[PDB]
mmCIF file of C-alpha atoms and ligand atoms in Angstrom:
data_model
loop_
_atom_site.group_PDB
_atom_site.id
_atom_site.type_symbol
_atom_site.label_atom_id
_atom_site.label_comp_id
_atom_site.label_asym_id
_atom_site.label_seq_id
_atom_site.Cartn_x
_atom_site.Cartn_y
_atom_site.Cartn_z
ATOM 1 C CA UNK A 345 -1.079 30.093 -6.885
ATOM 2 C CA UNK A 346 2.550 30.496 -6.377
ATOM 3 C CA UNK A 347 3.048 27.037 -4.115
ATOM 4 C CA UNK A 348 1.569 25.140 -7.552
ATOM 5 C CA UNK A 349 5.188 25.475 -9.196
ATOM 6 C CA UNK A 350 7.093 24.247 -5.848
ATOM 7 C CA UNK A 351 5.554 20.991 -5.912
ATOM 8 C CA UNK A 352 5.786 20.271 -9.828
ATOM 9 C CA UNK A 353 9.657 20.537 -9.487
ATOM 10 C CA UNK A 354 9.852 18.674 -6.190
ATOM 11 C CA UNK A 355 7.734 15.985 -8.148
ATOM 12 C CA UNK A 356 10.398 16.324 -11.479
ATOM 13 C CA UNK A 357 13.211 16.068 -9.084
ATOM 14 C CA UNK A 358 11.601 13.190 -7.392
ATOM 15 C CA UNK A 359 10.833 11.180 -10.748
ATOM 16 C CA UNK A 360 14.595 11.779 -11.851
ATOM 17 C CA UNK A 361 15.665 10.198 -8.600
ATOM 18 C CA UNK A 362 13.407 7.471 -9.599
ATOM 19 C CA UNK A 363 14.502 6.940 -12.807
ATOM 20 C CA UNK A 364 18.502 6.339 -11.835
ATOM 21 C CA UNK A 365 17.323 3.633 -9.237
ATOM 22 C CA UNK A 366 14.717 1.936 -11.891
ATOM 23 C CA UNK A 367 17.638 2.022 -14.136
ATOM 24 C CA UNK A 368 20.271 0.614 -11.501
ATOM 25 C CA UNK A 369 18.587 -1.088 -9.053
ATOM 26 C CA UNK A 370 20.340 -2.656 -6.012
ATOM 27 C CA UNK A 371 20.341 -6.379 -6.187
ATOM 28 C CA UNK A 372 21.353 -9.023 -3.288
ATOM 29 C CA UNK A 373 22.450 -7.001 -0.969
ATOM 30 C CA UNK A 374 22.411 -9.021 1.961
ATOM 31 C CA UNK A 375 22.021 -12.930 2.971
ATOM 32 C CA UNK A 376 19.720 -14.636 5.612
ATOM 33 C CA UNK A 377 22.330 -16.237 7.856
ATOM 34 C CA UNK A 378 23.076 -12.413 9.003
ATOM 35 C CA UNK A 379 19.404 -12.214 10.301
ATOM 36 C CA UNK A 380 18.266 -13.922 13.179
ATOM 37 C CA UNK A 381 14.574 -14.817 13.481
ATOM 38 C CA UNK A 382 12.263 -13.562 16.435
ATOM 39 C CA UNK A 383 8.511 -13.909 14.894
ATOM 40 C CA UNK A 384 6.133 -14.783 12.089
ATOM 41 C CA UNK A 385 4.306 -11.354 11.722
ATOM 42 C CA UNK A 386 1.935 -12.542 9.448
ATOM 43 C CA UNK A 387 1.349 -15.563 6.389
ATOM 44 C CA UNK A 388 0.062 -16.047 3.318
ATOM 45 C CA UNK A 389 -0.213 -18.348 0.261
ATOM 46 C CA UNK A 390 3.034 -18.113 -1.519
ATOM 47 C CA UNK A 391 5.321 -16.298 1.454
ATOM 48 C CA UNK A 392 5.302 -14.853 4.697
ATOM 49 C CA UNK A 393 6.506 -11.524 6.729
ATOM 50 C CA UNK A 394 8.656 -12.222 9.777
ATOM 51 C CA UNK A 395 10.399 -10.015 12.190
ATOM 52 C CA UNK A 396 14.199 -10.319 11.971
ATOM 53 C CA UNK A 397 17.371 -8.521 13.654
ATOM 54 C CA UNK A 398 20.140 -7.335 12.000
ATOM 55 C CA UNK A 399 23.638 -8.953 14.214
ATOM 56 C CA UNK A 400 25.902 -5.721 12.904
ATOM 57 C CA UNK A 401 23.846 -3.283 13.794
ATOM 58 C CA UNK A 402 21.284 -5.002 16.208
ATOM 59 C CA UNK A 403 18.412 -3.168 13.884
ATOM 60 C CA UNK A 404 14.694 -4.545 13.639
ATOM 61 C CA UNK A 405 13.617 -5.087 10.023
ATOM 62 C CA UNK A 406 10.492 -6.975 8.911
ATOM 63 C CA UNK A 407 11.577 -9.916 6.313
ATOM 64 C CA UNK A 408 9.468 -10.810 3.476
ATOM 65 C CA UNK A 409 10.087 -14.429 2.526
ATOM 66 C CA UNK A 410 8.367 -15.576 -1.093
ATOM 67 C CA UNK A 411 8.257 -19.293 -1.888
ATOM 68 C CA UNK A 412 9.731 -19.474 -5.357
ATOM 69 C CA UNK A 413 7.964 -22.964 -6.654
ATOM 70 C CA UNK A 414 4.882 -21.329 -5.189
ATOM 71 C CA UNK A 415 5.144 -17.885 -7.014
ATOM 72 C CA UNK A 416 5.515 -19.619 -10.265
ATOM 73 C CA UNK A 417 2.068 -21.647 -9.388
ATOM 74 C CA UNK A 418 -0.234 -19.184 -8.971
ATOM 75 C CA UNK A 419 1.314 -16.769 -12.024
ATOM 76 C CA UNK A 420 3.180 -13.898 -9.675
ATOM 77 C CA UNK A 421 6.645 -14.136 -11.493
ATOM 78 C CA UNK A 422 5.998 -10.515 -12.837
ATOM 79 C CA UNK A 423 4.575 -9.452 -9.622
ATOM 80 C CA UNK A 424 7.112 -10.216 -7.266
ATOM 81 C CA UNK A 425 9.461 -9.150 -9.590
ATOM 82 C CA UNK A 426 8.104 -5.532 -9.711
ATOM 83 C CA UNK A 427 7.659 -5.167 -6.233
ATOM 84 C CA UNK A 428 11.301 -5.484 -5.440
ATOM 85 C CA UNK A 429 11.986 -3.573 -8.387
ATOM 86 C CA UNK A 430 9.299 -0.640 -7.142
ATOM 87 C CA UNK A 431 10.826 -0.653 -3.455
ATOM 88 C CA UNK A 432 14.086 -0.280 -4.314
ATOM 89 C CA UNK A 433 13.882 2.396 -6.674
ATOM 90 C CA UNK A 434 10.919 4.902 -4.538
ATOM 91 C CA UNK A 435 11.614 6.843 -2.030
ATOM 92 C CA UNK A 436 8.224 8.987 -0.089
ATOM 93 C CA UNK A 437 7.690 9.474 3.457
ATOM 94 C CA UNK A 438 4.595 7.564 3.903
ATOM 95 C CA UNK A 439 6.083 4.281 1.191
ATOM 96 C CA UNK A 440 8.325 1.806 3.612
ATOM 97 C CA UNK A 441 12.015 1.392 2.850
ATOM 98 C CA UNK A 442 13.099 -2.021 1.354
ATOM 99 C CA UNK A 443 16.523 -1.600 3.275
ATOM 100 C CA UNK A 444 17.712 -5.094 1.900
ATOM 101 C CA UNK A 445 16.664 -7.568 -1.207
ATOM 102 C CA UNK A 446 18.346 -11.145 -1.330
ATOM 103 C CA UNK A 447 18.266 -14.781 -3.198
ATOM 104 C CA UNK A 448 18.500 -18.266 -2.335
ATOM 105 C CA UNK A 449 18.090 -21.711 -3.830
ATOM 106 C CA UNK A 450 14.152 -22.268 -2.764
ATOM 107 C CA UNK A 451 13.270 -18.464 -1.401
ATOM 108 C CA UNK A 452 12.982 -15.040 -2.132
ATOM 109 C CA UNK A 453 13.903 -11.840 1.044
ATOM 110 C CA UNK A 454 12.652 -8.593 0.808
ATOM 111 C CA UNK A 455 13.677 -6.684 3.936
ATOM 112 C CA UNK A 456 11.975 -3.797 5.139
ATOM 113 C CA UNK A 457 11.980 -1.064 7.683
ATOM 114 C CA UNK A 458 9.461 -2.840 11.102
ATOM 115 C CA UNK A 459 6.765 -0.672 12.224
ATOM 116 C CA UNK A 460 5.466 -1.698 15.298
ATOM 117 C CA UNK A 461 2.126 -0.318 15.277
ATOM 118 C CA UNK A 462 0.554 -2.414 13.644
ATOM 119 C CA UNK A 463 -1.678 -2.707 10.563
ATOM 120 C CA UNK A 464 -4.824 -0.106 10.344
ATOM 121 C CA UNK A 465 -7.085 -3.098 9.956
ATOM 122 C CA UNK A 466 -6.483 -4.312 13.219
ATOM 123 C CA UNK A 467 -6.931 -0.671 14.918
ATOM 124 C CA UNK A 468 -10.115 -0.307 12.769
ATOM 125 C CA UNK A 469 -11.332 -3.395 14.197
ATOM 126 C CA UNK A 470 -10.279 -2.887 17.690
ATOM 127 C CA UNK A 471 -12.360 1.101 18.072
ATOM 128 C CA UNK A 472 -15.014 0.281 15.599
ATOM 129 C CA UNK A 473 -14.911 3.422 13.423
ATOM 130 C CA UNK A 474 -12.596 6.089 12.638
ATOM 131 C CA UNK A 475 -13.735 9.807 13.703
ATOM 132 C CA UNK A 476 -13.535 12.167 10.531
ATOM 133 C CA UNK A 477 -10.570 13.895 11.235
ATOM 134 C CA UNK A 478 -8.793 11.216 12.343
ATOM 135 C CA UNK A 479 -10.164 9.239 8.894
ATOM 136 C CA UNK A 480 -8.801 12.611 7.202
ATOM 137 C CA UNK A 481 -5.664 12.228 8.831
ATOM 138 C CA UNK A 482 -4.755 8.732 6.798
ATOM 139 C CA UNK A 483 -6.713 9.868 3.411
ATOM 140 C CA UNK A 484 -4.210 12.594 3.114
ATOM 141 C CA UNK A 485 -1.457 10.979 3.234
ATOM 142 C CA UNK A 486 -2.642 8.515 1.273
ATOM 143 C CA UNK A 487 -3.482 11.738 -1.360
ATOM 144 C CA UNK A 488 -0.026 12.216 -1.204
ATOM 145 C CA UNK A 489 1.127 9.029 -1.956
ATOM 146 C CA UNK A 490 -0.921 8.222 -4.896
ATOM 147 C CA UNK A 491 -0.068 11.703 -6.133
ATOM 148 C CA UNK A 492 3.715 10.635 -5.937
ATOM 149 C CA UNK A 493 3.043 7.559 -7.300
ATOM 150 C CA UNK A 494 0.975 8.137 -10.246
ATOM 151 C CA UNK A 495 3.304 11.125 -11.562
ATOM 152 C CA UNK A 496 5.666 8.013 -11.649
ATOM 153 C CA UNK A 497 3.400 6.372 -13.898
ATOM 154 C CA UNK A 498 2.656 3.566 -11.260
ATOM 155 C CA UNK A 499 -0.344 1.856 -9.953
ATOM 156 C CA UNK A 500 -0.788 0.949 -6.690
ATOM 157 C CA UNK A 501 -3.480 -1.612 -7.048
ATOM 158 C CA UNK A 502 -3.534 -3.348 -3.358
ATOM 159 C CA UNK A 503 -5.021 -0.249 -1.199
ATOM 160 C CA UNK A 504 -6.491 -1.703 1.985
ATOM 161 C CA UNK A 505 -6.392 -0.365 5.732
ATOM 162 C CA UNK A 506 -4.439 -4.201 6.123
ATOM 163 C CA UNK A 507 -1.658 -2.849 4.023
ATOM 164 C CA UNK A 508 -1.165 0.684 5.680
ATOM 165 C CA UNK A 509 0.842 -0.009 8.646
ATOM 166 C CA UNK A 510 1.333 2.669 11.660
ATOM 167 C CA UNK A 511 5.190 4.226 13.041
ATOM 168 C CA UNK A 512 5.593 5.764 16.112
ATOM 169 C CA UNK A 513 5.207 8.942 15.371
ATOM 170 C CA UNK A 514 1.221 7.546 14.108
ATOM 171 C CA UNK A 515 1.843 8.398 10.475
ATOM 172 C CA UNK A 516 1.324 5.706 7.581
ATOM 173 C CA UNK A 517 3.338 3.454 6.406
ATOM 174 C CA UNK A 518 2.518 1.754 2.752
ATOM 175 C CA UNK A 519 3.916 -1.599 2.206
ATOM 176 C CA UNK A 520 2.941 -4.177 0.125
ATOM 177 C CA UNK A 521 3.453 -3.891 -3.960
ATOM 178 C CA UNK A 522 3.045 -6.962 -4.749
ATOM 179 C CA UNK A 523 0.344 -5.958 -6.735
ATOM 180 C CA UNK A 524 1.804 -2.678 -8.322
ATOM 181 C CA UNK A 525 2.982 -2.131 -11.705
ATOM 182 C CA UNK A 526 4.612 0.718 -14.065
ATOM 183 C CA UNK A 527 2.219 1.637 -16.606
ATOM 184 C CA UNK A 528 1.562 4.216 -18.855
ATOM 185 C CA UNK A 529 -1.909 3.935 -20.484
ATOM 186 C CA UNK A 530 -3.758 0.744 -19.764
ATOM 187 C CA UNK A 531 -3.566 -2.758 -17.879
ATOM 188 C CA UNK A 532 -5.392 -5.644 -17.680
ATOM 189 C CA UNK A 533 -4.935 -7.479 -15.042
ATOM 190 C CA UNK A 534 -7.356 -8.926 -12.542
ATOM 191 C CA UNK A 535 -5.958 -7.919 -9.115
ATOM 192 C CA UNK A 536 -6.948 -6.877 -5.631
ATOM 193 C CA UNK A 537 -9.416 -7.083 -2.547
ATOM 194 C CA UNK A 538 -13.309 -7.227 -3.863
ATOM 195 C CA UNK A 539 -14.300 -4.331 -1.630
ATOM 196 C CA UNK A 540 -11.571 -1.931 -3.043
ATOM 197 C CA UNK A 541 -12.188 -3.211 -6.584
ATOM 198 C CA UNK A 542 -13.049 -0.479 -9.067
ATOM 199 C CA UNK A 543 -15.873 -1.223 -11.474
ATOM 200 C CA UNK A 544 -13.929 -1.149 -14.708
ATOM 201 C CA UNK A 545 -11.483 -3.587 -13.187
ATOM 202 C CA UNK A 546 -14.478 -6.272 -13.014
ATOM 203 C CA UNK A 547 -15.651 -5.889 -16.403
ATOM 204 C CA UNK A 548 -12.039 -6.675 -17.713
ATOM 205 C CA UNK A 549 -11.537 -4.411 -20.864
ATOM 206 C CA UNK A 550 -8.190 -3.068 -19.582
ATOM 207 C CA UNK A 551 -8.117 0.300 -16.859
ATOM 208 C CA UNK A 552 -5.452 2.900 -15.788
ATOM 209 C CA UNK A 553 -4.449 4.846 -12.706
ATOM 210 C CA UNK A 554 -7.747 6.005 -12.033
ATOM 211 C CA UNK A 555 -8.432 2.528 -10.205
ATOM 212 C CA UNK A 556 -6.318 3.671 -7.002
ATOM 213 C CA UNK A 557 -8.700 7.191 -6.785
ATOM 214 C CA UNK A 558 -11.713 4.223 -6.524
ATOM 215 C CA UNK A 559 -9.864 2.462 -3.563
ATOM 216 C CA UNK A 560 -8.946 5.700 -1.843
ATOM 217 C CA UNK A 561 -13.303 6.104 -1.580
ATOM 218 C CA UNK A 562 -13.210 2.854 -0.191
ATOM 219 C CA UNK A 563 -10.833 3.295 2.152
ATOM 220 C CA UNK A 564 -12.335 6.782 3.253
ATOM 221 C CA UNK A 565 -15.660 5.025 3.634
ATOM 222 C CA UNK A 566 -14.337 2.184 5.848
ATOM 223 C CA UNK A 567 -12.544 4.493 7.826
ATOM 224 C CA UNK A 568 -15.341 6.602 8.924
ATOM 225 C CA UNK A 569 -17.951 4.124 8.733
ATOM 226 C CA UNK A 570 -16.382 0.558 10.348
ATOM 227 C CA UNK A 571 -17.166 -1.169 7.101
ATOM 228 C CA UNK A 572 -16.830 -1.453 4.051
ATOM 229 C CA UNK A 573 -19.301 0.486 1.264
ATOM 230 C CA UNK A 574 -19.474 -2.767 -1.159
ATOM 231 C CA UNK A 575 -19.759 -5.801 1.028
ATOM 232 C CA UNK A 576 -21.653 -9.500 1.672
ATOM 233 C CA UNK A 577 -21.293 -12.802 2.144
ATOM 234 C CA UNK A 578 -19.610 -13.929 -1.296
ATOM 235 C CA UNK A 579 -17.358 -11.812 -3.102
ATOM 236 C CA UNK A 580 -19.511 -12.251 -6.798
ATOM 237 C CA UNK A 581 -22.471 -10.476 -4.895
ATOM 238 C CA UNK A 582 -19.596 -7.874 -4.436
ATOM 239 C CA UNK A 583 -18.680 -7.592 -7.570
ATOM 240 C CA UNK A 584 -22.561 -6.744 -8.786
ATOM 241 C CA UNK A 585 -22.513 -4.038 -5.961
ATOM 242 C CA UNK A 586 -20.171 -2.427 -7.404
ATOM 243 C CA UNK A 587 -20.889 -2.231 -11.182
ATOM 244 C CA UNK A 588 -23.981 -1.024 -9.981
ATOM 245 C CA UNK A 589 -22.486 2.074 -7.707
ATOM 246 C CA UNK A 590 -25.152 2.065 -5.353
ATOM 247 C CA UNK A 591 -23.757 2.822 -2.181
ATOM 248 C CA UNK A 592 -25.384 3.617 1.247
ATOM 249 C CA UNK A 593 -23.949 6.347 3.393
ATOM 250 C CA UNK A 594 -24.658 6.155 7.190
ATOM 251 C CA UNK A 595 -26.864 8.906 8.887
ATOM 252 C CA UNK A 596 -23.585 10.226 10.919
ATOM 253 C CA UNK A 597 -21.174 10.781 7.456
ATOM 254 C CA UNK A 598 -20.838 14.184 6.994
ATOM 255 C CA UNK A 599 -22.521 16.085 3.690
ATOM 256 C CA UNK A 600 -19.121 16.896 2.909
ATOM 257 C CA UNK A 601 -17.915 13.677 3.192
ATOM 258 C CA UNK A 602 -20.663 12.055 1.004
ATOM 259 C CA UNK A 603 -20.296 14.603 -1.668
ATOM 260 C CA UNK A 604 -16.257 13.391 -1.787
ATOM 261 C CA UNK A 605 -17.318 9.278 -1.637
ATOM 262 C CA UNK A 606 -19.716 9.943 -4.536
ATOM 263 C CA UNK A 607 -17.686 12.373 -6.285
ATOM 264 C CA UNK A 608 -14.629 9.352 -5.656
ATOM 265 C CA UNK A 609 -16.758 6.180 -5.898
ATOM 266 C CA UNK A 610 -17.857 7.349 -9.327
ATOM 267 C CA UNK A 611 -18.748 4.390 -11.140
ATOM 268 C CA UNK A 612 -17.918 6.435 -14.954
ATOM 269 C CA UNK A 613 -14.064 7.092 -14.794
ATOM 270 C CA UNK A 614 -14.983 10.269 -16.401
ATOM 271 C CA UNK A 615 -16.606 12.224 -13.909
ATOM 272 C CA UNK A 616 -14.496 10.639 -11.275
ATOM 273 C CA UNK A 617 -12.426 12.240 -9.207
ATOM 274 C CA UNK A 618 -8.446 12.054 -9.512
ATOM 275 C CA UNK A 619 -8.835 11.520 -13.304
ATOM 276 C CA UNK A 620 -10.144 14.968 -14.379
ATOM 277 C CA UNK A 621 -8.299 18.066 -15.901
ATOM 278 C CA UNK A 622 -6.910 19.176 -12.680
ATOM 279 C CA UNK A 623 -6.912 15.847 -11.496
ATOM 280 C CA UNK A 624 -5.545 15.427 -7.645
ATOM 281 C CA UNK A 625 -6.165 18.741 -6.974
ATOM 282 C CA UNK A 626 -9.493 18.201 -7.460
ATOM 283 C CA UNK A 627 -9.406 16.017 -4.096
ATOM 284 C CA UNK A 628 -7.075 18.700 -2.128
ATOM 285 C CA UNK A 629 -9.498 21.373 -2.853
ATOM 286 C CA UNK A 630 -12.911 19.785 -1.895
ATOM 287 C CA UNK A 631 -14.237 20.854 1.333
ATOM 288 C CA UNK A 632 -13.999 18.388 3.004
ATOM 289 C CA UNK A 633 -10.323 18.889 2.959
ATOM 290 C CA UNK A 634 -10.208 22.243 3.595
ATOM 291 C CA UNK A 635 -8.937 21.704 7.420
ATOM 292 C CA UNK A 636 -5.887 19.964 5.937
ATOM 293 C CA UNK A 637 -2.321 21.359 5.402
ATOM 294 C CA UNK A 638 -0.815 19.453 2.541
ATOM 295 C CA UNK A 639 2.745 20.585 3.432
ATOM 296 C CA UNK A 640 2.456 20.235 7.177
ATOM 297 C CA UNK A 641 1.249 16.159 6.640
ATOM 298 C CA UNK A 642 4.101 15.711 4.313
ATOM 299 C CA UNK A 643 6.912 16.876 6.692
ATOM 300 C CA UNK A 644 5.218 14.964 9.403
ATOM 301 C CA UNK A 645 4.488 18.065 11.363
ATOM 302 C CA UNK A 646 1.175 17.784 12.006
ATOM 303 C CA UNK A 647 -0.156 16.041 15.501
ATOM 304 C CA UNK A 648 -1.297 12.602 14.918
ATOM 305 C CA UNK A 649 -4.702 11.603 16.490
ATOM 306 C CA UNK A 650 -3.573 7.984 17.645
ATOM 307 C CA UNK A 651 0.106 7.139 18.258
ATOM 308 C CA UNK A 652 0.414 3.818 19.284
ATOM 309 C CA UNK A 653 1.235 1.353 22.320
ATOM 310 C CA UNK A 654 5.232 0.741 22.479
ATOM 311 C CA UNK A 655 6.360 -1.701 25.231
ATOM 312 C CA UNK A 656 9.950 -2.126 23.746
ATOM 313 C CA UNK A 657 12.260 -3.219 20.285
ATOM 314 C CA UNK A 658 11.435 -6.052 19.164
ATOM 315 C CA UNK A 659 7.995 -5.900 20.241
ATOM 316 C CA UNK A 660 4.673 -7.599 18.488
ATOM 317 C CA UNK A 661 1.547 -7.162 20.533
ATOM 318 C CA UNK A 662 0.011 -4.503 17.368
ATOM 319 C CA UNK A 663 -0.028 -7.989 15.511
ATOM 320 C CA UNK A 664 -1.671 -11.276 15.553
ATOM 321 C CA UNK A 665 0.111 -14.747 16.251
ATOM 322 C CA UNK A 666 0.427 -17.694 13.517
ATOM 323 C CA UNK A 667 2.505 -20.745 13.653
ATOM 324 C CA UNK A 668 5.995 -20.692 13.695
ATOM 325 C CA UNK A 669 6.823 -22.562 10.241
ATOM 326 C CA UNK A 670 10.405 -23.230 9.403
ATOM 327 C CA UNK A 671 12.193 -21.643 6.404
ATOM 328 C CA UNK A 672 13.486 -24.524 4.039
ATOM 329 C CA UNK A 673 17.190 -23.914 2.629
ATOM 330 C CA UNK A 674 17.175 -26.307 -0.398
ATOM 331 C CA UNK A 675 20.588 -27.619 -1.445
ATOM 332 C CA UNK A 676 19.158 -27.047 -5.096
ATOM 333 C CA UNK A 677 18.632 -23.976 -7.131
ATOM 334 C CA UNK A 678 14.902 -23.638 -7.288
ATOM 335 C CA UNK A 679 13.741 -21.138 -10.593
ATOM 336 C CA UNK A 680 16.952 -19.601 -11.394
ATOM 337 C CA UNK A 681 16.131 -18.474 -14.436
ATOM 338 C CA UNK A 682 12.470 -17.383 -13.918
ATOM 339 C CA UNK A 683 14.235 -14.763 -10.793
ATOM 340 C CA UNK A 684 17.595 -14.231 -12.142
ATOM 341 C CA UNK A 685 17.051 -10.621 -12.208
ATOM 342 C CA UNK A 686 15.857 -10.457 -8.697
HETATM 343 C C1 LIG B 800 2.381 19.520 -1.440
HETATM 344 N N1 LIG B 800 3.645 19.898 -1.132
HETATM 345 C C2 LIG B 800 4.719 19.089 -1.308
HETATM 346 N N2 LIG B 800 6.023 19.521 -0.988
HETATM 347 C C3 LIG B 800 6.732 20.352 -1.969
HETATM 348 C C4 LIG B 800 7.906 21.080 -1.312
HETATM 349 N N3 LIG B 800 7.559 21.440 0.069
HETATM 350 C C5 LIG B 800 7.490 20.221 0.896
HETATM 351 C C6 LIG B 800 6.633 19.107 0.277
HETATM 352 C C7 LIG B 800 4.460 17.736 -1.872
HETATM 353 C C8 LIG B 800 5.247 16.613 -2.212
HETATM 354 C C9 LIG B 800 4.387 15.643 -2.702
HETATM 355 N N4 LIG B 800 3.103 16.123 -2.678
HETATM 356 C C10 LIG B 800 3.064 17.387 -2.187
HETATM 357 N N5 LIG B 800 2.087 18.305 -1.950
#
């Protein structure tokens, strides 16, 4: 009706504010020796996240730390580079602020806003299975996102319940585009979890922003159910799962919510849901949706159904611990040229 045309221009508005950030991005605007070092809040193959205060302002920010000799051997130059690049320029209630971006000789910083709670994975883990309104709850948002996103012309590629992160307030925090890219039309590469893989990712003649509408199924799916809708022991058998489409609902999903995950989880990218003529809206106005007040999740109005334990700032029990590894100031300029526009 009338509320169509009040989104469309918050949506233009929000793509010009875009635009002037992609187009003058923000670029070292901090240094590590005015963050001290509390924790290691999680690892990986080329970097780590850490938790990190702020001396001036005695603020808690998490610290992304990317190994440049190690991003250049496993082929993430491009990558990394968009995901500082993304970051800095969006700006959505439910995407995590990259608050600072900074170079040295062997490392790269990306620091964000902390949220405490702790990733969705863990919580998933912990209670077993998401209720469906509380499953709901996070699809929305993530709705929202994508919807935001996408009009952007960018791909999210790395949806995962380990990547949405929980505030306070028990709303969602996105982080994590290490794996997103601006693209209009098609891409190519091969990127991502296996379970959230959509099936023309795996059969590798290029795909477009339809891939994220997959992963939202999957997510969905391993919300409500506990697991995941494509899984075993290997992640080739998961592969031929999912080219297949054959998916197994458990007796307690509702019939609304298995007429979404099939109607998402559509194996042709034409029928599929989130690529059609009305596209999104196609996903707002299925039923089982129809409890859900678009405007009232994106102002944050709307009660969350878990809101998380908070001893105190500076806090880490929402995460798991890993070895306290040191961060390695080289004296030498490591890949100048392959991040000089970091
Ligand atoms: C429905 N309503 C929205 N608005 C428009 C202006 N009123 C507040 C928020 C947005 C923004 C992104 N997606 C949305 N869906």
């Amino acid at each position: 009706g009338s509320e169509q045309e009040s989104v469309k221009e918050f949506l233009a508005k929000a793509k010009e504010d875009f635009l002037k950030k992609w187009e003058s991005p923000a670029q070292n605007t901090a240094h590590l020796d005015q963050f001290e070092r509390i924790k290691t809040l999680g690892t990986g193959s080329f970097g780590r996240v850490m938790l990190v205060k702020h001396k001036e302002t005695g603020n808690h920010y998490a610290m992304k730390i990317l190994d440049k000799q190690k991003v250049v051997k496993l082929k993430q130059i491009e990558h990394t580079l968009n995901e500082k690049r993304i970051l800095q320029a969006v700006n959505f209630p439910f995407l995590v602020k990259l608050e600072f971006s900074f170079k040295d000789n062997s490392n790269l910083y990306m620091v964000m806003e902390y949220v405490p709670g702790g990733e969705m994975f863990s919580h998933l883990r912990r209670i077993g299975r998401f209720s469906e309104p509380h499953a709901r709850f996070y699809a929305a948002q993530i709705v929202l996102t994508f919807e935001y996103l996408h009009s952007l012309d960018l791909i999210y590629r790395d949806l995962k319940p380990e990547n949405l992160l929980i505030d306070q307030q028990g709303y969602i925090q996105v982080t994590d585009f290490g794996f997103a890219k601006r693209v209009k039309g098609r891409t190519w590469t091969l990127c991502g979890t296996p379970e959230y893989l959509a099936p023309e990712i795996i059969l590798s003649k290029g795909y477009n922003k339809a891939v994220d509408w997959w992963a939202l199924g999957v997510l969905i799916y391993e919300m409500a159910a506990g697991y995941p809708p494509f899984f075993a022991d290997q992640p080739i058998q998961i592969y031929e799962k999912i080219v297949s489409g054959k998916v197994r609902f458990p007796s307690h999903f509702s019939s609304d919510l298995k007429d979404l995950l099939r109607n998402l989880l559509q194996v042709d990218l034409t029928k599929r849901f989130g690529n059609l003529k009305n596209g999104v809206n196609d996903i707002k106005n299925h039923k089982w949706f129809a409890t859900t007040d678009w405007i009232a999740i994106y102002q944050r109005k709307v009660e969350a159904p878990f809101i998380p334990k908070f001893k105190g700032p500076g806090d880490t029990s929402n995460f798991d611990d890993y070895e306290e590894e040191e961060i390695r100031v080289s004296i030498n300029e490591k890949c100048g040229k392959e991040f000089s526009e970091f």
